[PDB]
Amino acid sequence: GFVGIRFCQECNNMLYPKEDKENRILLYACRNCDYQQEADNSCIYVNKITHEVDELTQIIADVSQDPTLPRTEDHPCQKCGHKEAVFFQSHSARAEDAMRLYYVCTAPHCGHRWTE
């Protein structure tokens, strides 16, 4: 997937990846403490190029009460069956790549985000 950040426990700085020459394992090392923790996921770096199309997580559920957004009745919510949804487009660097319509259910306390 993609690598997060780890934080030291004592000094609460970021943990750098360090390789030990004895066991030859991966360990995340604080570079201000003597703290070291053993790695759990051995991926140090990930760079995405084309696999970041998914804006469905970036959408929040609060946007359904935007009065300036279009509303539709043709696409019902798959979660709660509500007839009415707010649709809009991608608002990002990859907005030039599509008019993929993202739909948000307008029912209060549902907030289901879907596409097509």
Residues 6+ apart with CB under 8 A from 44: 3, 17, 26
Is 43 labeled as ligand-binding? Answer: no
**11 touches Zn ion by CB under 5 A:** yes
**Cβ contact 66:102 at 8 Å:** no
Residue 81 interface partner, choices another protein, Zn ion, none, CB cut-off 5-8 Å depending on type: none
Q: How far is the CB of 80 from another protein (least distance, A)?
A: 19
**112 touches another protein by CB under 8 A:** no
Cα 104 to chain centroid, rounded: 17
Provide the annotated binding site.
Answer: 8, 11, 30, 33, 77, 80, 105, 110
